[model samples]
Target chain A: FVNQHLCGSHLVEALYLVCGERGFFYTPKT
Target chain B: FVNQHLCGSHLVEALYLVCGERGFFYTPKT
Candidate 1:
């Protein structure tokens, strides 16, 4: 939940780049 | 994690504002 919108902020883009699209969902829903 | 879903801030360098060629520094009144 934090990675999606958190990484979507404009400040994030300006300062950095988007994180993994899979985020923390690549493995299991731990 | 270099991008934080980990952004690391490095503090070791000379900073300057460059419009194109001429180099200048701006020290905000703190």
Candidate 2:
């Protein structure tokens, strides 16, 4: 639920890409 | 669509506290 929507957010995409295009913040749900 | 759900997520809450209990990651929707 978090990962799906987190990536869906514009800000998440912006940060995820702008910071490190090759990097990714995988929000794992526990 | 983002902020409401972001905060609602368990991961977000964990980070929001782990980082700084007094601080909050206000996921701005645009």
Candidate 3:
């Protein structure tokens, strides 16, 4: 059976947290 | 699915570049 772990909204949220306000992904500058 | 983040926050930067948003997943779509 196929299970999409995150629903669309949660996926969107996860993306947002990762990407941030700019809506682009970044390698967090350590 | 494995945990990874590729969402973007570069929209502000992207907007400053002033273009419409688009999704660019690295396909194999894997």
Candidate 4:
């Protein structure tokens, strides 16, 4: 599903808050 | 700052909702 209306910056900020700095780098196990 | 307690799946779910499928592949401009 694609929603072009979503703001990338806001998404990043939200994800950053949810995942934090380390969460970004940590790849999930398959 | 690192918080080991955060759940990876939850983070992914939150990000997926906020950014959608495309947002993951779309790299932010520097």
Best by lDDT: 4
Chain B TM-score for all candidates, comma-separated: 0.25, 0.36, 0.27, 0.42
Sorted by DockQ (best first), the order is 4, 3, 1, 2
Per-residue lDDT tens digits for candidate 3, residues B1-30, read 444453244323332233223433321212
Candidates 1 and 3 compared by DockQ, better number = 3
TM-score for each candidate, following the candidate numbering = 0.18, 0.22, 0.29, 0.28
TM-score of 1: 0.18
**By DockQ, who's the top model here?**
4
Where does the lowest 10-residue lDDT sum fall in candidate 3 chain A? Answer: A21-30
Q: Report the alpha-carbon TM-score of model 4 versus the true structure.
A: 0.28
Give the residue spans of candidate 4 off by over 4 A: A1-30, B1-6, B25-30
Per-residue error (Å), model 4, residue B28: 17
Task: Report the lDDT tens digits of candidate 4 across residue range A1-30.
Answer: 445443556555444655775566332252
Candidate 3: where is the Cα deviation over 4 Å?
Answer: A1-4, A24-30, B1-30
Indicate the residue-level lDDT of A9 in model 2: 44
> Candidate 2: which docking quality band?
incorrect
Q: Give a tens-digit lDDT track for model 2, residues A1-30.
A: 145434334444444444442433434244
Ranking by lDDT: 4, 2, 3, 1
Q: Please estimate how well model 2 matches the true structure, expressed as its whole-model Cα lDDT.
A: 0.41
Candidate 1 lDDT score relative to the true structure: 0.29
Model 1: which docking level applies?
Answer: incorrect
Q: Which structure is stronger by DockQ: 1 or 2?
A: 1
Compose the digit string of candidate 2's lDDT tens values, residues B1-30: 144344334444454445442433434341
Error of 2 at B17 (Å): 2.9
Q: Please give the lDDT score at residue B19 for candidate 4.
A: 66
